């Protein structure tokens, strides 16, 4: 079966700020990818193997709001640009890619999926380039293999005059390495 | 209101599928013929009619959403039927694919006009016809999305 995705908004600007300060979030959680926000920015967090992972450049050192109050990070790695929290109750986890494939599929915050060719263990190129603004807010989102398993997390676009030609990602192996230290 | 990319569609005599791609609602000429499509404001005229490719197009209706065309080059495809079943087919030529796993003919009936999807969920072609051996479909004809793209541009 093919990779298809939908986005749902669960919370507006004002509710997000309030929840940010109290750290207490009563909403029901569903899905594999969470749309995530701070005061300055919005990005993605991907659940893999029971852990909810995102980019350090987004979450910094922060807790995540949960039904029990704020939750502290389980993993933190400034160098790989990674953070992880326990996956929220109700989320569903992806599992790492174990096929060896180099045809990847990036899932953006608007729930579009875009083909990428793996070009090395941390880079891939867009088979069909898009303006950088199509990728804004997609940091921490998943790169998928054809069977829908996780190959990596989107980190940054590689672009040229505002057009994304390629993407840097954190390989799923860096996740295991972060978990070990 | 959630939108659909595929519409289930009917005439007096049959029922089949249409698929929205690039703002156009596309289906098979052998089903729609030269007909208009219904709307709350009255019938709407075909934007495109191409008897050779077996292709017709109308402006996309209210309640719909466009599928984006495939641009990876994959030959693992997925056919979506009128019951929302999905059946894997392997691409064999540019108009042709084989089901990984053959099905009775009735399983595919009423699905012409539906999409064939690449692994990314993008449109590779429109299901044209089942390729049948004694009531078992084991292959499919389809209209490659390039034809749709050409028909528009021309």
């Amino acid at each position: 079966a093919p990779i298809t995705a939908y986005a749902q908004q669960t919370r507006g600007l004002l509710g997000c700020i309030i929840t940010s300060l109290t750290g207490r979030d009563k909403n029901q959680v569903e899905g594999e990818v969470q749309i995530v926000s701070t005061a300055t920015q919005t990005f993605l967090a991907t659940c893999i193997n029971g852990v909810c992972w995102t980019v350090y450049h987004g979450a910094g050192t922060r807790t995540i709001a949960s039904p029990k109050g704020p939750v502290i990070q389980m993993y933190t790695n400034v160098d790989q640009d990674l953070v992880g929290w326990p996956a929220p109750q109700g989320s569903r986890s992806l599992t790492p890619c174990t096929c060896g494939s180099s045809d990847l599929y990036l899932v953006t915050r608007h729930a579009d999926v875009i083909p990428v060719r793996r070009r090395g263990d941390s880079r891939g190129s867009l088979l069909s380039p898009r303006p950088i603004s199509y990728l804004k807010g997609s940091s921490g989102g998943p790169l998928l293999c054809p069977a829908g398993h996780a190959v990596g997390l989107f980190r940054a676009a590689v672009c040229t005059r505002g057009v994304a030609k390629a993407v840097d990602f954190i390989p799923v192996e860096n996740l295991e390495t972060t978990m070990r230290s | 209101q959630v939108e659909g990319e595929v519409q289930i569609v009917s005439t007096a005599t049959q029922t089949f599928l249409a698929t929205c791609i690039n703002g156009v609602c596309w289906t098979v000429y052998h089903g729609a013929g030269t007909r208009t499509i219904a709307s709350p404001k009255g019938p709407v005229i075909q934007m495109y009619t191409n008897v050779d490719q077996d292709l017709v197009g109308w402006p996309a209706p209210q309640g719909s959403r466009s599928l984006t065309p495939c641009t990876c080059g994959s030959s693992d495809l997925y056919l979506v039927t009128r019951h929302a079943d999905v059946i894997p087919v392997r691409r064999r030529g540019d108009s042709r694919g084989s089901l990984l796993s053959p099905r009775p003919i009735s399983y595919l009936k009423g699905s012409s006009g539906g999409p064939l999807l690449c692994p990314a969920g993008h449109a590779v072609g429109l299901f044209r016809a089942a390729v049948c051996t004694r009531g078992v479909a084991k292959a499919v004809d389809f209209i490659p999305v390039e034809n749709l793209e050409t028909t528009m541009r021309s």
Binding site: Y6, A7, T10, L21, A59, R62, T63, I64 | -
Partner: peptide
């Protein structure tokens, strides 16, 4: 600093479906 807050979600596990009338 404030907590990170879930403001939405993306669901990969849904399959094609007929939209209920």
């Amino acid at each position: 600093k404030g907590s990170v807050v879930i403001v939405g979600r993306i669901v990969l596990s849904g399959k094609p479906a007929i939209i209920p009338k």
